[PDB]
Amino acid sequence: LTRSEAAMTVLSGHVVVCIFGDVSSALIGLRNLVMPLRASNFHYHELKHIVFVGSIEYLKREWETLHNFPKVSILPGTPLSRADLRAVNINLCDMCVILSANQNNIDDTSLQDKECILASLNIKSMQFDTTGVNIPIITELVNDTNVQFLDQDDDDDPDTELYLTQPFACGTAFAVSVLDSLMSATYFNDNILTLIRTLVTGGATPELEALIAEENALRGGYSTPQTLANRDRCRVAQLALLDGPFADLGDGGCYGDLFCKALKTYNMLCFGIYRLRDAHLSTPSQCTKRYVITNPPYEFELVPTDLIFCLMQFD
Amino acid sequence: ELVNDTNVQFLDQDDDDDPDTELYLTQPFACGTAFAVSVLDSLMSATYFNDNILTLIRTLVTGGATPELEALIAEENALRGGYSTPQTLANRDRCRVAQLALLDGPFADLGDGGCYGDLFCKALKTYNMLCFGIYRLRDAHLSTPSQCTKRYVITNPPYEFELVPTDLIFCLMQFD
Amino acid sequence: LESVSNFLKDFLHKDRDDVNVEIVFLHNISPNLELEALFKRHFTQVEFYQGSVLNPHDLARVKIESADACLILANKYCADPDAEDASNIMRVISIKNYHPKIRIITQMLQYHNKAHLLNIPSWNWKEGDDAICLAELKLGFIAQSCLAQGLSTMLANLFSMRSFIKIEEDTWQKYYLEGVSNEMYTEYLSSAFVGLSFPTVCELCFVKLKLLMIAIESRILINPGNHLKIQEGTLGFFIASDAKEVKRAFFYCKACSNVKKYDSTGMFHWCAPKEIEKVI
Ligand SMILES: [Ca+2]
Ligand SMILES: [Ca+2]
Ligand SMILES: [Ca+2]
């Protein structure tokens, strides 16, 4: 697409993937971003559109790994130019993902994450006929100490482990180093890596590994009753507690009761909440940032503004 | 433009050279034929002691770009053209910098050995000219004639300062 | 040595002031060789601390929360100007992330990168944060010299702090050094000047109290026309030998259409975008 075509192509609820990259840079492996977003678990109307923003010289030499997926588009451009991000309706997306291929070509601890930090600040600082600070962004960081530059309403100290920092606790920063402990976790229990792969990849099983190993591309096939039976598995979802079936209990009520009724009536198995950073404070606040609570105890208190992490069946 | 300011010594051959000399003293710099980024080093200090200086210099030097232009270029990275309006035209009415030859009709009457202060005062009242220096031939004070056409810069001469007919005037002049 | 020497000899200039400031450098690489000699020459008001401005403990070590301002110097001779500017913006966000209220002055190598600097939420030029873009100012001084040759050297001499060197011989250097002796200064206009037109106060200040006035704060106006008159509380821009001489600008009473021709603002001429083959 060119910027005019994108501006007239009304995009909403989509995913924008900002890629810093170059003709000679190392290949990111974008199939793995697209496949979980293209599981048969979603109805075709439910699939989020994906827009890559970046160098076409980079994207060309990856396209053949993902050209068999629906609702994908490319804008030749830069994540640092306001015009591109306005053309792809950055204020209406469900997620903006910021990635860099240029992680290994220079090593100075500063020079590794410059572009991603500038891009996140560029998006945050925009104005729309709202300011951009409310846009959902996730940034990959090469060096986890640089996390301190992503937020300015937080407390920074380089001795702090990444998992304690605000943008990580909110799920707006991610770094490959948090997978280091997956080695140890997998040694002590081989089932963990199995569960995480099926939960995260879209559910790929050894038959898919074999088919891709033989053919290196995802081969399409005609549908059958067994082909359709494989769609009947759970997908992960976030539910707003202000919705009709649960606002009756998101009023100061009980997480255990919410779990029990959602499980019996819909098989929902909600496994955590996403809680506004200031919602425990007595004063109002303009901060829309949320942080993650995993497996709250039965007696835990439900504020009406909370979001519920849950697993929900196919239909 | 010179990358290394010591190399200034090679630009002219009718001058005196010594590498210990600060660039601002040398003939091709004093004449305004050489420029080096190092002369902007002291703009750091000058801006610390007085934040208004950088504002004035940017409006005097850039053509007058204001924060609205910075915003428009920041958003669009290209200068977007627009259709004209009375307000659009009002923005044209600002001063431009100019050099005036003192041999011209309105001022040759006073460029004969006359007074810079008197020139300033009449040009200011009659044309709003605010002339802020002169560009003086390098040999014009000497008794002998010379073939040298090179000129050097005098900033803010005192009121009593003497005007040779061959001088050029730095000035600020209104739109029309 | 090549970046700080021209700065120090102007910051610590003989004619500057009775009160000293600065004294704090920090850099990740130690001051080897001749640079340390330059520090020795100024030891009573210059101190170097090894450290990196990306580390908040080093910002604490140099007491950033107490500093009047922070100055960021650029590698003018680097192989990748956008890398340098991104690096210096990283330094700016490090400093502002550590402390909202410190004033920052920074060198920028390329013009477009200045936009990034405006994204930082705790940066505001209304409070004196600003960026000196070297490409912008270099090519601008050259451009104005295409209109009036010599103007680049005039403007460059109006910033650098210089005394009046006296010369006894009649050579061109005598008159030149006289002109070099002044700088651009600013002061609030005395109430005696309020309510009357700008050319008249230029004439008054020049004739009676020997100050050349270029511009006034009607946000920032160079040489405004005879229709415009002085408001109370206005700031004037003066060219003068020394700052103390400008104070009598204040201490004074009666002492003795269908087509696009322009950019969207009307500030610059404009035309439709030509293919390069049309202009070669
Ligand atoms: Ca921070
Ligand atoms: Ca020479
Ligand atoms: Ca000077």
Which chains are adjacent to chain A, needing at least 3 Cβ pairs under 8 Å? B, C
8 Å CB contact between C234 and C185: no
Q: Which of C211, C157, C223 is nearest to C187 (CA)?
A: C211
Residues of B in contact with C207 (CB under 8 A): 117, 121, 159
Residue A103 assigned as binding residue? no
Q: How many angstroms separate the CA atoms of C256 and C208, rounded?
A: 9
Q: How many angstroms separate the CA atoms of A227 and A221, rounded?
A: 9
In the three-class reduction of DSSP (H, G, I as helix; E, B as strand; rest coil), residue C50 is classed as strand
Q: Does C135 touch chain B (CB under 8 A)?
A: no
Nearest CA in chain B to A78: B77
Helix (H) or strand (E) holding C206: helix C198-209
**Yes or no, beta carbons of C89 and A118 under 8 Å apart:** yes
In the three-class reduction of DSSP (H, G, I as helix; E, B as strand; rest coil), residue B12 is classed as coil
Beta bridge partners of C130: C105
- Please compute Rg for chain B using Cα positions: 20
φ, ψ of residue A235 in degrees (nearest 5): -120, 150
**Yes or no, beta carbons of C115 and B64 under 8 Å apart:** no
Please indicate the experimental technique that yielded this structure: cryo-EM
Both structure tokens of C45 = 């008001």
User: From residue B25, how far is each of B10, B11, B32 by CA, in Å?
Assistant: 15, 14, 11
Q: Which of C265, C223, C259, C271 is nearest to B89 (CA)?
A: C265
In the three-class reduction of DSSP (H, G, I as helix; E, B as strand; rest coil), residue C165 is classed as coil
Residue B41 assigned as binding residue? no
What single letter denotes the amino acid at residue C41?
R
Handedness of CA A235, A237, A241, A242 (dihedral sign): negative
Q: Does C101 touch chain A (CB under 8 A)?
A: no
Chain position carrying tokens 């004739």: C207
8 Å CB contact between B98 and B168: no
DSSP state of C144: H
Residues 6+ apart with CB under 8 A from C197: C226, C227, C228, C229, C230
8 Å CB contact between C216 and B57: no
Q: Which of C151, C224, C261 has the CB atom closest to B84's CB atom?
A: C261
Q: How many CB pairs under 8 A join A and B?
A: 7
User: From residue B80, how far is each of A279, B74, C177, C264, C272 by CA, in Å?
Assistant: 45, 12, 45, 6, 10
Q: How many angstroms separate the CA atoms of A9 and A6, rounded?
A: 5
Q: How many CB pairs under 8 A join B and C?
A: 273
What is the whole-number distance in angstroms between the Cα of residue C140 and the centre of ligand 2? 27
Nearest CA in chain B to C272: B81
Å resolution of this model? 2.9
Give one word for C275, left, alpha or beta, with left for phi > 0 and alpha for psi -120 to 50: beta
What is the whole-number distance in angstroms between the Cα of residue A99 and the centre of ligand 1? 20
A69-101: string of b/e by CB count within 10 Å (b at 16+)? eeebbbbbbbbbbbebbbbbbbbebebbbbbbb
φ, ψ of residue B105 in degrees (nearest 5): -45, -50
8 Å CB contact between A40 and A230: yes
Complete DSSP assignment for B14-65: SS---TTS-GGGSHHHHTT---BGGGGTHHHHHHHH-THHHHHHHHHHSSS-
Q: Which ligand is nearest to the CA of A154?
A: 1
- Please compute Rg for chain A using Cα positions: 21
Both structure tokens of A315 = 């239909």
Q: Which of C34, C24, C23, C30 is nearest to C1 (CA)?
A: C34
Residue B12 assigned as binding residue? yes
Query: How many CB atoms are located within 10 Å of the residue C245 CB?
Result: 16
DSSP state of B151: E
Q: Sort strands B168-173 and C23-27 into parallel, antiparallel or unpaired.
A: unpaired
Residues of C in contact with B53 (CB under 8 A): 159, 184, 186
8 Å CB contact between C135 and C110: yes
Chain position carrying tokens 């409006």: B59
**Yes or no, beta carbons of C119 and A122 under 8 Å apart:** yes
In the three-class reduction of DSSP (H, G, I as helix; E, B as strand; rest coil), residue B110 is classed as coil
DSSP state of C118: T
- Please compute Rg for chain C using Cα positions: 23
8 Å CB contact between A168 and A147: yes
What is the whole-number distance in angstroms between the Cα of residue C70 and the centre of ligand 1? 19
8 Å CB contact between C165 and B24: no
Nearest CA in chain C to A113: C90
What is the whole-number distance in angstroms between the Cα of residue A147 and the centre of ligand 1? 7
3-state secondary structure chain A: CCHHHHHHCCCCCCEEEEEECCCCCCCCCCHHHHHHHHCCCCCCCCCCCEEEEECHHHHHHHHCCCCCCCCEEEEECCCCCHHHHHHCCHHHCCEEEEEECCCCCCCCCCCCCHHHHHHHHHHHCCECCCEHHHCCEEEEECCHHHHHHCCCCCCCCCCCCHHHCHHHHCCCEEEHHHHCHHHHHHHHCCHHHHHHHHHHCCCCCHHHHHHHHHHCCCCCCCCCHHHHHCCCCCEEEEEECCCCCCCCCCCCEEHHHHHHHHHHHHCCCCCEEEEECCCCCCCCCCCCCEEEEECCCCCCEECCCCEEEEEECCC
8 Å CB contact between C179 and C165: no
8 Å CB contact between B168 and B134: yes
Q: Which ligand is nearest to the CA of B27?
A: 2
Both structure tokens of B43 = 């703009």
What is the whole-number distance in angstroms between the Cα of residue A240 and the centre of ligand 3? 66
